[PDB]
Design a protein around this motif. Structure first.
Motif, PDB file in Angstrom:
ATOM      1  N   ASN A  89     -47.285   7.968  28.852  1.00  0.00           N
ATOM      2  CA  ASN A  89     -47.711   8.927  29.999  1.00  0.00           C
ATOM      3  C   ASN A  89     -47.469   8.288  30.923  1.00  0.00           C
ATOM      4  N   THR A 120     -43.224  11.473  29.535  1.00  0.00           N
ATOM      5  CA  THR A 120     -44.164  11.444  28.393  1.00  0.00           C
ATOM      6  C   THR A 120     -42.822  11.106  26.993  1.00  0.00           C
ATOM      7  N   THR A 148     -51.687   6.244  20.564  1.00  0.00           N
ATOM      8  CA  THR A 148     -50.462   6.692  19.245  1.00  0.00           C
ATOM      9  C   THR A 148     -51.104   7.387  18.205  1.00  0.00           C
ATOM     10  N   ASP A 190     -46.060   7.620  16.127  1.00  0.00           N
ATOM     11  CA  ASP A 190     -44.996   8.634  16.558  1.00  0.00           C
ATOM     12  C   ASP A 190     -45.699   8.026  17.742  1.00  0.00           C
ATOM     13  N   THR A 191     -46.026   7.362  18.625  1.00  0.00           N
ATOM     14  CA  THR A 191     -46.418   6.705  19.672  1.00  0.00           C
ATOM     15  C   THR A 191     -45.796   6.897  21.066  1.00  0.00           C
ATOM     16  N   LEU A 192     -47.150   7.732  21.831  1.00  0.00           N
ATOM     17  CA  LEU A 192     -46.099   8.072  23.464  1.00  0.00           C
ATOM     18  C   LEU A 192     -46.811   7.495  24.508  1.00  0.00           C
ATOM     19  N   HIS A 194     -42.204   8.946  24.565  1.00  0.00           N
ATOM     20  CA  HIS A 194     -41.735   9.433  22.729  1.00  0.00           C
ATOM     21  C   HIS A 194     -41.528   7.953  21.598  1.00  0.00           C
ATOM     22  N   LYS A 219     -40.453   6.320  18.582  1.00  0.00           N
ATOM     23  CA  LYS A 219     -40.366   7.005  17.172  1.00  0.00           C
ATOM     24  C   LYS A 219     -40.529   5.405  16.228  1.00  0.00           C
TER      25      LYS A 219
END
Ligand SMILES: CC(=O)N[C@@H]1[C@@H](O)[C@H](O)[C@@H](CO)O[C@H]1O
Ligand SMILES: CC(=O)N[C@@H]1[C@@H](O)[C@H](O)[C@@H](CO)O[C@H]1O
Lengths: 287, 287
Positions: B256, B212, B240, B252-254, B214, B216
């Protein structure tokens, strides 16, 4: 989910009188919502002639402008916010006005040595630019006039000559353009004309008492010329003859039976559209 | 006997649309007569939108203007001539238009370091003069702005700042005046605001495969701020989060489950009414 916004737009060819409404609605997003409007970074509460209709039950808010004056031009932003995020969308209010004449120029007849001021005004959005081109009959070509020595173009396109010359004859053109349409263009004919002049500043007329005294006052000028005689700043009612010529006219006036209280100075005053002149004729009655 | 003329006059408070008629008639004089009209020394045959009605049987001639556009302003002369002399009389066509706004100024929110251009236009006869006065809250007194270094007033009263500064805050006033009425006056509030900036130009994010990841991207600015992520100039649809703050917001978007074709560079782009910024975040997936 965060709110997403339905793009909105203002009308295409907007004119001063018209009303404008734009609806800020949602594509998607979970309530509750809060609508907010901006114009060019300023909040819409400022501009009170703009009022917004909001019906949050239907998930929309409408901006209304009852009559679009050009101050309304700019970018309007609607912001929708919920407890997951915000979306926003900006639409531009655009307006164009092609030039219309405020003060059209026309053919002009100037006095040599005078200080002429031709006017040429126009209005529109953006504010139009006023430019003068004189036509040189050396090959009927335009040449921009501009603020020379002995010439001037004021803030509003008024072309001013300081001393008018024979140099400053012929046809001129002022042109109003703001980027919309082709603009305006007006061709005018300038002609130069000379102020009238009495031939003789002051002449002595002397006679014996009780005779048909004969006064004389020819003047140079372009017709018409309107001559008025006077004594001590009072009009002469007495018999007056005013025969014309080509280069002006002559005024032969006579007073029957002279007197010693009539003896003094008299004034042949001429008036015209190109100026005015005065000759002072003097009379003495000897015994 | 020579002809004598009956004085004539144009209406008093003349407005653009109106018609105007003036009659040139006689007091006295023996026929036959010849009527002739002039405008500012130019013969009336030139201006065809002006036509004259003449009925010599009644010893009169009438000038007519079906709609007075401001070019008609000036002096109109009627000349009557017979075989004993001529009389003439000139009357002035006068018109005044007080200023109306073309482009009203409004409250403004400027970007520091940008090149602002406030507009303030008006129209009327004569063409109005546009002057700017800033209010110094040192004692709320007007002081004319004028074309300084770092300032400018264009042909049409548009006030332009070259680099906007904190110096250039507070309320200003533009004033349109042409001599008719009191003119117009508009008070506006200028406020200065800062373009948004991503805190960090470019940061490396490195992870092992299948985690995951992460990302920024906090940014400084004044709300609202609308952030869009990208990769090779394509939008990221993925999950997001965009939480706000006071001095801006953070995003802060991630992503996976990582892949080696996802490995590359990404773009956190922010847009606002006061500017736009971009940070480029880079991702590498090691084994
Ligand atoms: C209100 C108005 O007419 N503003 C114009 C502006 O649009 C134009 O870009 C500028 C160029 O000098 O001249 C002025
Ligand atoms: C068409 C027009 O507005 N003309 C005016 C003129 O009347 C005025 O005397 C001059 C002063 O600078 O400015 C210009």
């Amino acid at each position: 989910s965060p709110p997403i916004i339905n793009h909105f737009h203002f009308s295409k060819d907007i004119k001063e009188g018209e009303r404008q409404q734009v609806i800020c609605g949602l594509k998607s997003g979970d309530p509750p919502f809060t609508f907010s409007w901006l114009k060019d970074g300023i909040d819409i509460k400022n501009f009170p002639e703009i009022n917004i209709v909001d019906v949050p039950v239907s998930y929309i808010s409408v901006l209304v402008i009852s009559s679009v004056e050009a101050k309304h031009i700019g970018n309007y932003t609607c912001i929708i916010k919920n407890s997951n995020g915000m979306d926003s969308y900006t639409a531009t209010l655009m307006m164009k006005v092609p030039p219309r004449w405020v003060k059209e120029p026309t053919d002009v007849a100037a006095t040599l040595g005078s200080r002429l001021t031709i006017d040429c005004s126009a209005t529109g959005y953006p504010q139009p630019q006023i430019t003068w081109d004189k036509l040189t009959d050396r090959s009927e070509h335009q040449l921009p006039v501009g603020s020379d020595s002995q010439r001037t173009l004021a803030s509003n396109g008024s072309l001013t000559f300081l001393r008018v010359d024979e140099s400053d004859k012929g046809v001129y053109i002022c042109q109003a353009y703001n980027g919309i349409g082709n603009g305006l263009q007006k061709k005018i004919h300038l002609t130069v004309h000379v102020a009238p002049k009495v031939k003789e500043d002051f002449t002595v007329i002397t006679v014996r008492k009780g005779f048909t005294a004969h006064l004389k006052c020819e003047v140079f000028g372009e017709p018409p010329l309107n001559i008025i005689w006077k004594k001590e700043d009072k009009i002469i009612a007495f018999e007056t003859l005013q025969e014309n010529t080509a280069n002006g006219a002559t005024s032969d006036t006579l007073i029957n039976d002279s007197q010693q209280n009539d003896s003094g100075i008299y004034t042949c005053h001429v008036s015209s559209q190109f100026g005015e002149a005065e000759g002072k004729i003097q009379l003495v009655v000897l015994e």
